[PDB]
Amino acid sequence: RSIMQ
Amino acid sequence: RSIMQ
Amino acid sequence: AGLRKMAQPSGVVEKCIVRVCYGNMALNGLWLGDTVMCPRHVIASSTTSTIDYDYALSVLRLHNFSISSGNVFLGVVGVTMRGALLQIKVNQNNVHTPKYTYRTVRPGESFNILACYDGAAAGVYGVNMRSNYTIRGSFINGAAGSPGYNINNGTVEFCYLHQLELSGCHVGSDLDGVMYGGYEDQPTLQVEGASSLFTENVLAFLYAALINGSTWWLSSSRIAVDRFNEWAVHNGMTTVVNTDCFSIFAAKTGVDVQRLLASIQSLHKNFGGKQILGYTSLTDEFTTGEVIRQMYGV
Amino acid sequence: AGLRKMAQPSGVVEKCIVRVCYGNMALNGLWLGDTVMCPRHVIASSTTSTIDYDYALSVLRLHNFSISSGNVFLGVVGVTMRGALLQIKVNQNNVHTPKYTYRTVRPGESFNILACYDGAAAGVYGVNMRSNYTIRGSFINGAAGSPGYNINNGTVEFCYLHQLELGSGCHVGSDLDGVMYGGYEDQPTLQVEGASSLFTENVLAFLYAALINGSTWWLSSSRIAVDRFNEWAVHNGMTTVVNTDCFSIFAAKTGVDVQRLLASIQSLHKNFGGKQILGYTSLTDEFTTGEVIRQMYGV
Numbered sequence: 074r075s076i077m078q
Numbered sequence: 079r080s081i082m083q
Numbered sequence: 084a085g086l087r088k089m090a091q092p093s094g095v096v097e098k099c100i101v102r103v104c105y106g107n108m109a110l111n112g113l114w115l116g117d118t119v120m121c122p123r124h125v126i127a128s129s130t131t132s133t134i135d136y137d138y139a140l141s142v143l144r145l146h147n148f149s150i151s152s153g154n155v156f157l158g159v160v161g162v163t164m165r166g167a168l169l170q171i172k173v174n175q176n177n178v179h180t181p182k183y184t185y186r187t188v189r190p191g192e193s194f195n196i197l198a199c200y201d202g203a204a205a206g207v208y209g210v211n212m213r214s215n216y217t218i219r220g221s222f223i224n225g226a227a228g229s230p231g232y233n234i235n236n237g238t239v240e241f242c243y244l245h246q247l248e249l250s251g252c253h254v255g256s257d258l259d260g261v262m263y264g265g266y267e268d269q270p271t272l273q274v275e276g277a278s279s280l281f282t283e284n285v286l287a288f289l290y291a292a293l294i295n296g297s298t299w300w301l302s303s304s305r306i307a308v309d310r311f312n313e314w315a316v317h318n319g320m321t322t323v324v325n326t327d328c329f330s331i332f333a334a335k336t337g338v339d340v341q342r343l344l345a346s347i348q349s350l351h352k353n354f355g356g357k358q359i360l361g362y363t364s365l366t367d368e369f370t371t372g373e374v375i376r377q378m379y380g381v
Numbered sequence: 382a383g384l385r386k387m388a389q390p391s392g393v394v395e396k397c398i399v400r401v402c403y404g405n406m407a408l409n410g411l412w413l414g415d416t417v418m419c420p421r422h423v424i425a426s427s428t429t430s431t432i433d434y435d436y437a438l439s440v441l442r443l444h445n446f447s448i449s450s451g452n453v454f455l456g457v458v459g460v461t462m463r464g465a466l467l468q469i470k471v472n473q474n475n476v477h478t479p480k481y482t483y484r485t486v487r488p489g490e491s492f493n494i495l496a497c498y499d500g501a502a503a504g505v506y507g508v509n510m511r512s513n514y515t516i517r518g519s520f521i522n523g524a525a526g527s528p529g530y531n532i533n534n535g536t537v538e539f540c541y542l543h544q545l546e547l548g549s550g551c552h553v554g555s556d557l558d559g560v561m562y563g564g565y566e567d568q569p570t571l572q573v574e575g576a577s578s579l580f581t582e583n584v585l586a587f588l589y590a591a592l593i594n595g596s597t598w599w600l601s602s603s604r605i606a607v608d609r610f611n612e613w614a615v616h617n618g619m620t621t622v623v624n625t626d627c628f629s630i631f632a633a634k635t636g637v638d639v640q641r642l643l644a645s646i647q648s649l650h651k652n653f654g655g656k657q658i659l660g661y662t663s664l665t666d667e668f669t670t671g672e673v674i675r676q677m678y679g680v
Contacts, residue, residue, distance in 0.1 A: 075248045076270050078110040078124040078227040079548035080569050082422045083408075083525045084550040085519035089496065089504035094392030198387065200679060206387035207505060219660070221383040221676050251383035251594060251659070295550065355655045355662040361517065363662045377519050380498060 086291050086360055086377055088368055090195045090207040091234045098179035101157065102202025103171070103228065104149040111199040111228030112150065112171070113244065113258075115180050119150055119157070119171040120258060121228045122246050123164065124268055133269055140164055151202060152177075166260020167246060167268040183239040185258040188231075190214045190321070191281040193370050194242050198222060199229045211284065211368045214321050215276035216264025218243075219368075220253040231255065249275045280320045282311075282347070283328075284367040289343050290332035291374045292359045300359060301338065302346040311344040318351060320365075328371045384590045384659050384676060386667055388493040388505040389532045396477035399455065400500025401469075401526065402447040409497040409526030410448065410469070411542065411557075413478050417448055417455070417469040418557060419526045420544050421462060422567055431568050438462060449500060450475075464559020465544060465567040481537040483557040486529075488512045489580040489620075491669050492540050496520060497527040509583065509667045512620065513575040514563025515551035517667070518543070529554065547574050579619045581610075581646070582627070583666035586673045588642045589631040591658050593677050599658060600637065605644040617650055627670050 103112040103121045106128060112121035126143055127134045143162060150157040150173060158174035188194055190212050198206040198221065210218040222229065222245060231243025243255045246268050252275050256262045266273055312322040326340050333339045350364040358364065375381050401410040401419045404426065410419035424441055425432045441460060448455040448471060456472035486492060488510050496504040496519065508516040508529070520527065520543055529541025541554040544567050551574050555561045565572055592600065611621040625639045632638045646664065653662050674680055
């Protein structure tokens, strides 16, 4: 859902 | 009662 | 005396963090030898739609990477896809590369997170893989690529590279690029499986509490392993499958697993009424291995 | 998202730990420049009665020391008392000595513990100084001399060397000037810690972090003024709040002002009613506004 890239 | 470590 | 969730010392891993930038994206990489490993979402040219990573790699240009160790920049020689990771070959060997292995961790196992931002380590803390293959971490934007590791007898065992967040629910891949739990490295509508307390770790914690002098919660009744397991899967706890690890504890404390299991059922009914060693009654973040080290140095 | 007690990375401190042995005693020292600091009870010859350390120093034989960094042994040049510490001059400078300062921390302040055994770091975890000048640690025999530290802009600020466990399991150290926190004695005597009050400013930081992470069930419209809260606090094991300025930016990103949180604290101080806040079932004062700010936003 939320990528922390 | 104190315990030195 | 005492029990704290702690991390193994991070020095040997700190020298392996790099900053990996591509386009408008920046995250962290792990530099071992002449390779940098990092999540492949760094080459994604999107923020909502669903990503074809093979296409993104086909249009990639090596000179658009900026990879740095502090203020030292690394030249990129090649890129290969490794599951949910990129394997980026660079023109410099990391002289501080430790002896290392890769290992995929299983639910209930503890390891260490080195939380990184902008290619530099920021914090370190111990975690425990949950039954739904998420960790209870603290990560904000830019933490992807943060490594998880254990240290065994001089060798660093790398088990995790941070990828994404589902509500304090964090997900990463192992170093072969296999995403824990099968979650996609895509910003999609996926929901984590049901979180259950890891019972074998609760048992370690309650033995630790006994050894530190906490007994108010100890039941005098007793329940067999296989009956408890029937109850556990309708009450948010995992099944107990190994008990041989508790033989040392049962001998030092005089309390067998079956009394601890009955105590767990009773704690689940006045849940929150009183703490154990200052912790929630049913904490599952400590393994038997962790408890033995903190109790006895072994 | 998420909140965890974490430690700052320990690499720069790991290079400073040494093993200090004398007779039947073994503990840890901190090697900065050409000096090793360690608790002075390493030269004690008893474990029950009260020790005349000045006498123990007068009959010390410098060659009965063994000080090692890994398998590198350090020769002892001289030894002087520094409060509850020995300041041991050695014949070698530690080339990996970081930029460093000393500072004595105050109740409510957080720092990092590097738990050490046999002169090697074993674990690292965050702690918070309690109102009775003890910490909630995990230490067993051999841990004395383990350092506590913070890192700011690459400078290591040393604030603690571990000394002793009180009869209940609370942990006590000295600062690096050799002054014992809380005035406890570095003697194996009967001394009992004072009562520990919850540090209210830290509890508020925890509750703001809960709101930022979407935990709001415990919040209501009910409200209490600082003064009415401070009267309840002194009868309920919590500290008084005096300045609420540090919570301005928290109230601005959440829309919830302190007075509402203060009223929530009163309800929660008893129990959470079977529910949890970020995994906790009791209020915690281990998190400072500064830790929360960094974890929530990176600043």
